[PDB]
Amino acid sequence: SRPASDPQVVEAARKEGRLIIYSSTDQSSAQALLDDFRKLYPFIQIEYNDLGTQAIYDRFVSETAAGASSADLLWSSAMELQVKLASEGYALPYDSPEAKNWPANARLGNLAYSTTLEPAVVVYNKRFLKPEEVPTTREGLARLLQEPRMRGRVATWDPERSAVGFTILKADYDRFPAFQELARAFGKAQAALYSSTGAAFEKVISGEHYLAYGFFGSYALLRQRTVKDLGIAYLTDGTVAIQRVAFINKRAAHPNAAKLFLDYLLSLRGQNLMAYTALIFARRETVVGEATPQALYKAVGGKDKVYAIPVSTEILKNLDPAERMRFLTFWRQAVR
Numbered sequence: 111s112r113p114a115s116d117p118q119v120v121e122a123a124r125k126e127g128r129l130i131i132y133s134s135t136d137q138s139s140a141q142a143l144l145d146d147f148r149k150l151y152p153f154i155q156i157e158y159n160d161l162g163t164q165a166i167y168d169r170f171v172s173e174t175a176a177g178a179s180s181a182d183l184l185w186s187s188a189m190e191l192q193v194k195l196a197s198e199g200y201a202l203p204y205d206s207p208e209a210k211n212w213p214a215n216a217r218l219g220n221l222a223y224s225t226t227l228e229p230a231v232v233v234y235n236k237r238f239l240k241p242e243e244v245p246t247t248r249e250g251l252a253r254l255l256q257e258p259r260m261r262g263r264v265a266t267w268d269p270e271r272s273a274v275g276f277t278i279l280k281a282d283y284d285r286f287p288a289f290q291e292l293a294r295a296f297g298k299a300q301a302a303l304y305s306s307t308g309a310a311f312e313k314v315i316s317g318e319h320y321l322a323y324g325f326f327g328s329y330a331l332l333r334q335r336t337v338k339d340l341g342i343a344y345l346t347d348g349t350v351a352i353q354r355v356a357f358i359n360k361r362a363a364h365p366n367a368a369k370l371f372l373d374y375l376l377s378l379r380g381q382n383l384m385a386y387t388a389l390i391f392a393r394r395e396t397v398v399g400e401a402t403p404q405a406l407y408k409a410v411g412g413k414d415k416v417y418a419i420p421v422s423t424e425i426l427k428n429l430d431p432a433e434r435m436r437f438l439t440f441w442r443q444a445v446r
């Protein structure tokens with residue numbers, strides 16, 4: 111199909127000829143979307159900057175303050191940082207014609223948009239834990255992590271080095287009382303903390319760890335295609351879902367190419383390519399593939415077991431110094 115971008119926006123984007131992206135989306139997961147968008151619009155050269163969530167924020171703020179060349183479009187899983195920027199004058203207002211039935215809590219008016227509904231899952235190495243050994247609750251994982259064999263065998267986020275690690279563990283702490291028991295079991299099991307999914311997965315795949323808690327189901331699905339021993343367990347007591355936020359740089363040199371790429375990401379075409387080929391868990395329900403809301407809800411035991419973090423100015427509460435203090439004081443003491 112063809113994203114419903116205005117023909118004037120397509121022509122203005124052809125005159126630009128170039129799109130600069132700053133994204134936290136691993137290029138391995140983004141590549142089929144970049145390739146399909148280039149098929150749709152062969153007259154746009156894409157520069158894809160695969161970067162950490164905190165680095166995207168710091169670099170965009172710096173380059174903007176210097177009056178320097180920056181990104182046309184920012185795409186990041188660190189929801190609070192994206193909502194902060196889009197609510198402080200960094201976002202180009204644009205009403206996507208592909209976002210007409212987005213819920214109000216999946217967009218910041220016309221400033222920024224949900225592009226995904228991506229669960230925080232458990233991944234494990236089947237050579238070391240069989241599917242039957244891997245509990246699907248915070249209470250059951252706390253019990254497994256009491257076992258001597260699990261000491262040194264757990265990976266999770268470092269929320270002090272990954273801004274999305276903070277997004278995901280902060281939401282878990284806020285919504286699930288059992289997260290506290292689980293965090294103390296991270297301490298008991300001497301959990302190693304990582305600033306990226308890839309660094310935690312590498313250790314699970316080698317067997318250095320048996321289990322990783324809280325990383326993107328999107329990355330796990332795609333890694334499974336080439337790594338037979340990767341298992342995925344979905345939490346049935348409650349699953350945190352992030353929504354990768356996209357917004358256009360207010361000072362983009364190529365605003366129209368950015369509009370085309372945003373509309374593509376939100377379109378049936380982009381969302382189906384996410385669900386079927388990229389194996390990024392799509393935001394849209396009307397999709398076919400393995401990485402769908404329907405597949406997520408079936409695995410966790412209903413939509414009511416998913417807490418989707420909203421794309422809302424309300425989530426900036428998580429950046430309040432007292433709220434960061436409460437979470438990080440509890441966290442640091444539990445996991446050491």
Ligand SMILES: [Cl-]
Pocket residue numbers: 303304305306309
């Ligand atoms: Cl790391």
Ligand SMILES: [Cl-]
Pocket residue numbers: 418
């Ligand atoms: Cl939702």
